[PDB]
Amino acid sequence: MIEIKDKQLTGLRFIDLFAGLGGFRLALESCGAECVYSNEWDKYAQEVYEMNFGEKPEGDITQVNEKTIPDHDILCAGFPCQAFSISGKQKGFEDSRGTLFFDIARIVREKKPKVVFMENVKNFASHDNGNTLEVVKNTMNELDYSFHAKVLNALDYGIPQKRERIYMICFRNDLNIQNFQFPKPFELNTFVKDLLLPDSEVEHLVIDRKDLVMTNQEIEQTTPKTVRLGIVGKGGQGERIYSTRGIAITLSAYGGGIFAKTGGYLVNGKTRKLHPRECARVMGYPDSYKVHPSTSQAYKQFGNSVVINVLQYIAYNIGSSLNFKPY
DNA sequence: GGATGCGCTGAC
DNA sequence: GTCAGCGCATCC
Ligand SMILES: Nc1ncnc2c1ncn2[C@@H]1O[C@H](CSCC[C@H](N)C(=O)O)[C@@H](O)[C@H]1O
Numbered sequence: 001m002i003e004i005k006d007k008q009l010t011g012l013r014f015i016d017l018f019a020g021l022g023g024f025r026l027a028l029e030s031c032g033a034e035c036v037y038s039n040e041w042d043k044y045a046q047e048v049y050e051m052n053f054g055e056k057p058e059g060d061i062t063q064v065n066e067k068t069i070p071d072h073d074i075l076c077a078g079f080p081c082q083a084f085s086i087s088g089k090q091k092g093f094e095d096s097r098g099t100l101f102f103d104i105a106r107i108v109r110e111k112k113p114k115v116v117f118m119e120n121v122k123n124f125a126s127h128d129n130g131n132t133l134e135v136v137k138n139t140m141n142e143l144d145y146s147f148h149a150k151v152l153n154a155l156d157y158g159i160p161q162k163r164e165r166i167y168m169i170c171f172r173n174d175l176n177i178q179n180f181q182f183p184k185p186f187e188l189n190t191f192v193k194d195l196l197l198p199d200s201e202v203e204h205l206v207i208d209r210k211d212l213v214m215t216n217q218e219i220e221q222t223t224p225k226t227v228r229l230g231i232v233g234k235g236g237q238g239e240r241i242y243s244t245r246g247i248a249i250t251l252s253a254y255g256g257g258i259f260a261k262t263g264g265y266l267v268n269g270k271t272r273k274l275h276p277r278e279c280a281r282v283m284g285y286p287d288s289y290k291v292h293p294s295t296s297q298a299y300k301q302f303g304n305s306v307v308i309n310v311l312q313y314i315a316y317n318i319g320s321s322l323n324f325k326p327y
Numbered sequence: 328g329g330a331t332g333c334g335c336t337g338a339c
Numbered sequence: 340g341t342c343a344g345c346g347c348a349t350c351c
């Protein structure tokens with residue numbers, strides 16, 4: 001994550017729904033905002049969240065009386081994506097894990113914050129012939145909010161990962177916000193190789209599979225794209241090896257394969273998956289952020305998370321718009 | 328819970 | 340056909 005000198009969100013209160021690691025919290029607090037409520041029902045996510053923020057998020061949002069939620073200016077929510085992801089069954093709103101957006105709407109209807117800041121996977125924008133995105137748009141409009149949505153790729157914002165996500169920013173209409181803009185892309189100057197830990201700290205992640213098939217030669221020049229070098233087994237998810245001179249593939253939460261949830265990388269002549277701390281870095285988390293003691297849970301958590309830097313640029317722009325109040 | 332072989336869609 | 344994918348199935 002980056003340092004933000006001009007704290008555009010100072011004096012603003014926000015809530016951290018589907019909190020996870022608290023990615024939205026890091027991003028908004030870096031702009032000066034204050035978190036006044038957090039919600040996350042996973043046992044291990046609550047533990048790591050508490051480890052880093054000193055609070056245990058409240059459980060199951062579907063059982064929370066929206067009236068008990070503290071007043072706030074901005075509502076943050078990177079809601080569940082298993083039901084919308086290209087990697088899933090795409091049952092969408094029909095999936096028991098796909099109706100969480102309506103809980104968000106329920107809370108918005110009651111608390112009417114100035115801004116609603118949501119995130120989900122790229123496929124969310126095309127799911128069900130665009131009807132899924134349309135439903136969210138119309139729901140927000142019905143609640144009297146504007147609706148700004150765009151898919152942003154983390155590689156365009158200084159983080160070496162091909163993570164494409166749809167970001168939805170909604171402003172309460174009475175605010176008459178007409179100048180919100182998504183951050184402009186800029187040249188990537190950091191690559192996977194730049195975030196790796198020393199070999200001595202990741203030896204246990206090195207695997208030598210006899211069914212390794214290197215399909216492409218290593219590149220010497222860094223490039224802002226994923227560069228597959230080979231595969232193991234049948235080349236499915238978690239069975240693909242990439243160049244550290246390129247960018248990381250999208251980290252996943254329930255991913256399988258031998259290089260599960262992070263993908264495999266060619267590092268100093270050896271093939272290995274990423275260490276949880278490298279996952280943190282690939283997600284824009286500062287080294288000061290404490291990862292969960294269970295490596296399996298840590299991989300899951302970062303795989304479900306958001307790239308801090310991207311949220312920071314968006315948050316700064318939300319604040320920039322909220323603060324432009326000329327006579 | 329932890330680990331890993333795979334399905335199979337969206338977007339080229 | 341090629342590649343990527345906050346995933347799924349199944350085993351202990
Ligand atoms: N009913 C529910 N109540 C509370 N949290 C829920 C929930 N259903 C799913 N979640 C939580 O929703 C999260 C979605 S992933 C979002 C992660 C978050 N942006 C962070 O930065 O890491 C998961 O952590 C999941 O456990």
